[PDB]
Amino acid sequence: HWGYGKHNGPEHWHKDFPIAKGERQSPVDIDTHTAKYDPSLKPLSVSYDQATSLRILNNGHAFNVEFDDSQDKAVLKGGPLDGTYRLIQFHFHWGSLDGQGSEHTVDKKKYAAELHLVHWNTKYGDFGKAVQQPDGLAVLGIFLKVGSAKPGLQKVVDVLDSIKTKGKSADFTNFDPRGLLPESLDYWTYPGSLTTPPLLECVTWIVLKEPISVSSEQVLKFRKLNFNGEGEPEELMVDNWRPAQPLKNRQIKASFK
Ligand SMILES: O=c1cccccc1O
Numbered sequence: 001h002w003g004y005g006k007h008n009g010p011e012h013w014h015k016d017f018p019i020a021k022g023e024r025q026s027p028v029d030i031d032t033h034t035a036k037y038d039p040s041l042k043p044l045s046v047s048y049d050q051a052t053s054l055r056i057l058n059n060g061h062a063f064n065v066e067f068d069d070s071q072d073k074a075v076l077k078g079g080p081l082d083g084t085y086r087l088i089q090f091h092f093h094w095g096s097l098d099g100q101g102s103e104h105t106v107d108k109k110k111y112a113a114e115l116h117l118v119h120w121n122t123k124y125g126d127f128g129k130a131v132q133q134p135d136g137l138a139v140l141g142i143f144l145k146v147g148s149a150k151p152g153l154q155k156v157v158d159v160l161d162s163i164k165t166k167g168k169s170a171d172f173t174n175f176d177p178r179g180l181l182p183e184s185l186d187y188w189t190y191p192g193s194l195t196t197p198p199l200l201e202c203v204t205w206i207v208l209k210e211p212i213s214v215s216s217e218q219v220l221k222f223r224k225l226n227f228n229g230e231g232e233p234e235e236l237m238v239d240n241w242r243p244a245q246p247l248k249n250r251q252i253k254a255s256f257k
């Protein structure tokens with residue numbers, strides 16, 4: 001099945017998921033010079049103070065921190081959105097080396113990692129219905145640069161030893177995702193897709209301008225995870241990023257001048 005290696009990676013995905021070659025694929029390069037300021041965009045509204053994290057899961061391609069999305073506990077609205085979107089999970093994409101790992105790029109620059117906070121449009125009832133819709137998801141993407149530690153990430157780093165292999169999970173209650181956010185909520189936005197199979201074109205992407213800094217030790221710990229299952233040959237979970245896709249004349253809008 002699909003992965004990130006030479007024989008099952010991004011170049012191969014189109015065979016099983018032909019939408020890989022679609023008109024609104026992600027990620028993209030964000031060319032800042034050609035992203036137009038849109039004064040009709042609203043500020044983003046991030047309402048996470050009642051977030052209820054549940055669990056952390058190594059799914060074979062990343063680690064997901066899952067939330068209770070059966071009520072409006074942690075929601076995203078405003079910005080480019082015209083609905084309420086409920087947080088279901090966050091995860092990261094990252095590199096084998098600090099100079100690569102993000103999915104989006106900014107003027108062709110790669111960050112060491114990218115955080116995705118995944119939300120679904122509550123008018124569709126459930127995540128599974130939302131992913132059948134062109135406005136079903138909103139993903140808040142945040143770049144990670146290596147520098148100082150991010151204290152609000154450390155609780156995630158600490159638990160990774162307990163979910164080293166595919167299919168492992170651990171309780172992860174009482175995690176506050178607000179400690180993963182940068183100061184500014186200035187963003188770019190464009191219509192796109194999931195960046196992993198099934199690559200569905202459901203996503204309003206909201207990419208924050210301001211990176212967060214994480215330490216070299218924090219990202220090192222991410223790189224000790226495994227793609228494989230327990231008892232299988234060890235394959236370090238690194239370079240789980242899709243490269244930038246053709247923009248296909250979409251326009252990226254900026255909330256800021
Ligand atoms: O950002 C994501 C959102 C939803 C599902 C799968 C994979 C992803 O990388």
Ligand SMILES: [Zn+2]
Nearest residue numbers: 091093116195
């Ligand atoms: Zn992702």
